[PDB]
Amino acid sequence: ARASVLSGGELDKWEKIRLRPGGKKQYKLKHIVWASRELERFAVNPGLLETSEGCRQILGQLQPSLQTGSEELRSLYNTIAVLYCVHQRIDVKDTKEALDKIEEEQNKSKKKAQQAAADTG
Amino acid sequence: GARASVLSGGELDKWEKIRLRPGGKKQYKLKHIVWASRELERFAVNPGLLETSEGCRQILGQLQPSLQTGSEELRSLYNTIAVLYCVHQRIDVKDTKEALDKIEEEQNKSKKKAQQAAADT
Ligand SMILES: O=P(O)(O)O[C@H]1[C@@H](OP(=O)(O)O)[C@@H](OP(=O)(O)O)[C@@H](OP(=O)(O)O)[C@@H](OP(=O)(O)O)[C@H]1OP(=O)(O)O
Ligand SMILES: O=P(O)(O)O[C@H]1[C@@H](OP(=O)(O)O)[C@@H](OP(=O)(O)O)[C@@H](OP(=O)(O)O)[C@@H](OP(=O)(O)O)[C@H]1OP(=O)(O)O
């Protein structure tokens, strides 16, 4: 699960992203292996880490449990959030920025969906 | 019509400076409150809920699922009540677009303070 999930280029940008905004630990291979084993624990298909859409669907499954979520649950969500941004080639420098951008991309997409339907005709 | 129970004095003078469209010339008037009031009755929604920040919030939650497929009338009604909410909340807006952006920004920050409140146990 250390070569199927990310490409070579994806990995090099993965290993520069910091776990927390003002911290110097960064993401490693071990966080990919861990998230993989975690999803199986949660009865989720780990193969979905391999793509943007797969990651999106995982975050959709996990979102409802996020506010009451344990630290393990929150760490798993944040990791997959960073993976999604990587797959999308959205630049991020830490976990918080990936969450902000995913939030920003959900608003943009819902906006364009409303404009597209509204201007239909 | 009168329907002068919805906005106070300070609120009415802010209402009438807000533009219907972000860079437009027409601004909200008393006839837009009268109209929104009658529109809600026709949608079988309590128009007295226009009189408070909490009332407008509950209306927006009622109408939101219908928004993407809504007609111009439905969208106009939603937009009008989004501005009223911002007026009641003393959120400074200058047009309908900004009112919608700030409601979304407010929902984002409440959901994350709630996630941080629980996350700190
Ligand atoms: O390959 P390097 O010369 O070692 O520089 C890279 C990198 O810069 P690049 O993206 O151009 O490779 C980092 O930060 P960003 O530029 O992505 O913002 C980071 O910079 P910091 O000094 O701020 O940490 C750090 O430079 P350095 O190795 O001197 O500490 C990093 O190496 P790391 O990714 O392992 O931190
Ligand atoms: O006669 P006024 O009521 O004083 O209208 C003027 C003004 O127009 P003038 O520059 O010609 O005086 C502005 O609008 P524009 O003509 O440039 O479009 C301004 O507009 P904003 O609301 O965007 O700030 C505002 O209009 P409003 O009536 O909404 O307050 C403002 O005068 P006030 O300082 O009296 O508001």
From TrEMBL, chain B:
CC per GO annotation: host cell nucleus; host cell plasma membrane; host multivesicular body; viral nucleocapsid; virion membrane
Molecular-function GO terms, alphabetical: RNA binding; structural molecule activity
Principal subcellular localisation of the protein: host cell
Alphabetical UniProt keywords: Capsid protein, Host cell membrane, Host cytoplasm, Host endosome, Host membrane, Host nucleus, Lipoprotein, Membrane, Myristate, Phosphoprotein, RNA-binding, Viral nucleoprotein, Virion
Domain named Immunodeficiency lentiviral matrix N-terminal: residues: 1-121
Location(s), subcellular: Host cell membrane; Host cytoplasm; Host endosome, Host multivesicular body; Host nucleus
Protein name (database record): Gag polyprotein
Full-sequence range covered: 2 to 122 of 373
